[PDB]
Amino acid sequence: AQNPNCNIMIFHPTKEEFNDFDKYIAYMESQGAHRAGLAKIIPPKEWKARETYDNISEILIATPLQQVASGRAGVFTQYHKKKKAMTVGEYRHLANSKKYQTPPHQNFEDLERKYWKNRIYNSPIYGADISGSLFDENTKQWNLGHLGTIQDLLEKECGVVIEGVNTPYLYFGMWKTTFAWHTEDMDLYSINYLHLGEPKTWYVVPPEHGQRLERLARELFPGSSRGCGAFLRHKVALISPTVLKENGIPFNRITQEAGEFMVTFPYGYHAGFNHGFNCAEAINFATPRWIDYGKMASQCSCGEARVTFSMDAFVRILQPERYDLWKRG
């Protein structure tokens, strides 16, 4: 069996290997990459997403989110407080201001220590799930605005057309901005390109051990757990690597830098934080291997779910028994 220890694997495709997205995802899985839940892909030197990032300051962040934490340093939740709209130029200035700028640090490890020591005592501002793309039209390889849609994948695999579209999202980050433990909607894959700026550190649990994380989360957030059988779908809960290790949860970590892709795999729980001002782009996608995960994916019905885009048709076709009551929610 490939990658039995579920290590995060890093791939360096040639320009020839970078032409067929589906084929390369399949290749990575043939080497066991999905067992980790997360893989890094470094594009060939000949490739670029766009020519320059000099003209992005006028993008609007319509609803910046101030991430206020409650709890303890290693076990906390965050609430996303809506702020006034601002441009990316204004956001970048704010991220670099004395209140929000990255502190001095020796290396990624030192910054990671500072993050988990001090995160809860600050409330950074985050731009999330902004429909849009920064890939040049003329970028033909791994352009997250030109992948095959999930609706087309479901039709190809299962035979029925469904409504819906599948478009990419932009994310604007600063130091300590945080993404809570989650899998993707309907346990889809995701792919994330870091366009510009400072790194993003990721934590991931192997899909085969995902239920171990869920059990710990129920123990650590018992009120939330009584309110919803799938409360990690709310995307507000954080657990530190130290607490995961204390509780024997298998996980791995890796830092993504500008110009690098990360792929998350079906039912791979992940969480992480940004090191400083950056801009990323991401989209969910599917493969034939996703179908059985979509059939089994947990759903939140309590009204608290954070869902990036409409999964109704996926639930309707893949989970007909659930459809009705999931829809009541």
Ligand SMILES: [NH3+]NC(=O)[C@H](NC(=O)CCCCc1ccccc1)c1nn[nH]n1
């Ligand atoms: N799949 N997505 C990810 O892995 C990361 N983004 C998120 O999870 C979005 C977190 C927003 C959650 C939220 C917002 C408002 C109210 C409640 C919860 C990401 N961040 N940067 N790149 N990816």
Ligand SMILES: [Cl-]
């Ligand atoms: Cl700090």
Ligand code: NI
């Ligand atoms: Ni994600």
Ligand SMILES: [Zn+2]
């Ligand atoms: Zn819920």
